[PDB]
C-alpha cells in the first residue's frame, strides 16, 4: 500500500497549502499517516466540519491541484501575513487567494467557473474574520461582507464575524474554510462584497481504496 508519511503536516494543512506542507503538493496515497505532533504554522484558521473535509480528501487520495484562470476584477490579489511567513517574508496558503480592497473600494465580485471536464471538482475556499471594525473597513471597505458560493444544485452564503480571539501567531482574526464540489456540467459562481478568501483552481477527486491513519509509528 502506498503510504504517504505526513511528517509534520496534517492532511488539511497539506490540502490548503501551509508553507511547510508544500512539500506535499500533488501527492497521492493509499494511506496518509498523520502524526500526533503535526502542527500549523500559518494564518490561524478553523474548519466547520473538519471531520468530513478530512474524511473526503483522505478517501479521495490525491492532492493534485489544477490552477484555474479566475479573474479578480479590481481588488488586490495575493495577500500575505507574517503569521504564514513563506520564507524571509510574509505569505499565505499556497492554494488560497486572499483578496483585499482596491484603491478605496471593494466591488461586488461575481465570477463564474464552469465544470467542462468529465469529473467532479473539489473547491476549497474561505472567509476572513477581522477582529476589529478598523480592520474590516480597512481591508474590505464595506464593513459588512458576505460570501455566496453556489452551483445549480447547491448554495452557500457565509457572513463574517468581527471580534476578538486569542492571539494565535500574532493574529486575533481567523479564517473559516468551506468547500464545494462541482459535478460535471454544473457551474461554480463566487459572489461577494468582501472578506472572500478566494480559490485558485480545484483539486481532482478520485474514488478508491484510500484513507488516513493517525500514528507516530516508523514507516
Amino acid at each position, epitope marked *: 500500500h502506498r503510504i504517504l508519511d505526513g511528517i509534520d503536516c496534517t492532511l488539511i494543512d497539506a490540502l490548503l497549502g501551509d508553507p511547510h*506542507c508544500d512539500v506535499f503538493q500533488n*501527492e497521492t496515497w493509499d494511506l496518509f499517516v498523520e502524526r500526533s*505532533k503535526a502542527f500549523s504554522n500559518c494564518y490561524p484558521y478553523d474548519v466547520p466540519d473538519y471531520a468530513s473535509l478530512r474524511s473526503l480528501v483522505a478517501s479521495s487520495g490525491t492532492l493534485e491541484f489544477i490552477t484555474e484562470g479566475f479573474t479578480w476584477t479590481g481588488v488586490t490579489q495575493n495577500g500575505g501575513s507574517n503569521a504564514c511567513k513563506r520564507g524571509p517574508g510574509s505569505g499565505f496558503f499556497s492554494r488560497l487567494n486572499w483578496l483585499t480592497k482596491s484603491g478605496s473600494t471593494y466591488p461586488v465580485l461575481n465570477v463564474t467557473m464552469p465544470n467542462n471536464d468529465n469529473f467532479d471538482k473539489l473547491y476549497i475556499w474561505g472567509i476572513h474574520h477581522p477582529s476589529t471594525n478598523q480592520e474590516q473597513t480597512s481591508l474590505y471597505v464595506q464593513a459588512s461582507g458576505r460570501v455566496t458560493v453556489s452551483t445549480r444544485r447547491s448554495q452557500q452564503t457565509i457572513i463574517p464575524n468581527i471580534g476578538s480571539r486569542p492571539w494565535v501567531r500574532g493574529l486575533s482574526s481567523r479564517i473559516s474554510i468551506y468547500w464545494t464540489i462541482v459535478k460535471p456540467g454544473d457551474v461554480l459562481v463566487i459572489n461577494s462584497n468582501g472578506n472572500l478568501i478566494a480559490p485558485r483552481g480545484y483539486f481532482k477527486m478520485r474514488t478508491g481504496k484510500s484513507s488516513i491513519m493517525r500514528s507516530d509509528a516508523p514507516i
Partner: antibody
Amino acid sequence: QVQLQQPGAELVRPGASVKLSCKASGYTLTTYWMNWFKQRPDQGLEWIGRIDPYDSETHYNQKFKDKAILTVDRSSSTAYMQLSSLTSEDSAVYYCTRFLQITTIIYGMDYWGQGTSVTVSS
Amino acid sequence: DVVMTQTPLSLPVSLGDQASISCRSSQTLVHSNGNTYLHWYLQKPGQSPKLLIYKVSNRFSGVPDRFSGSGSGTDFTLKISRVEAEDLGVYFCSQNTHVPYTFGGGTKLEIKR
C-alpha cells in the same frame, strides 16, 4: 515548531570524553532517524553516524567507529553522542539532525540543531 | 566513499545576477529504486545548514522559485536566477544514496557591491 536543542559550547580537557545532548522537540523522536555531523572550521562537514531512536539501531562511519557512541533516551526525547579520548582534531562544531528515512518524500535531513562547539584544551 | 566535488569555490555575483554552483560525484547517485538522493544545503555564516533543494530538483519548504537544481547521475547544479542580498552564504551539495553520506566542500557565494 520542530526544534533540535544543542548546548552551544563545551570545553573538554584532552584525553577525556564529552557526552553531547540534542533534545528533540516539535515532532516524535522515535518516528524518524538521527544523524550526527562534525564540521571542522575549515568548512568540512563529516558524517559521524546514525541512530534509529525507535530501537537504537546505530550505524557509524568506520572512521568514528572507535570514538563516537550514539544513544538516545526515549523518555526525554534526548539523543546523545559520546566522544572519548578527545584530541585537538576533535575540536569542531557538532550537529545532530532529523534524518528523514527513505520512506519519506524527502529522505535527507531537514532540521539541524544549533550545533555545539567542542574546545579540546588544557 | 563518494566524493562530492564542487566548483566554484567562491562565487562573486552582483545583486540581480545569476549564480551557478556545480557538484560532481565520484559515482552515480541513482538509487536502486531509481531515486537520486542528491541535496543542496545553505549554511549562512554563524548558523546551521538549511535544506534548500532535495532529491536534485525539489524545493524544500520555504525556498523561493528563484532557486533551481538539476543533473543526472554524477553532475548536478544549483542555479539562482536572480541573486538577492540575503542569498549571501555557503552552499554544499551532499548525497544520501551511498553510506557514508558525503558532503561537498562548499561554495562560498559573495555579493558584489
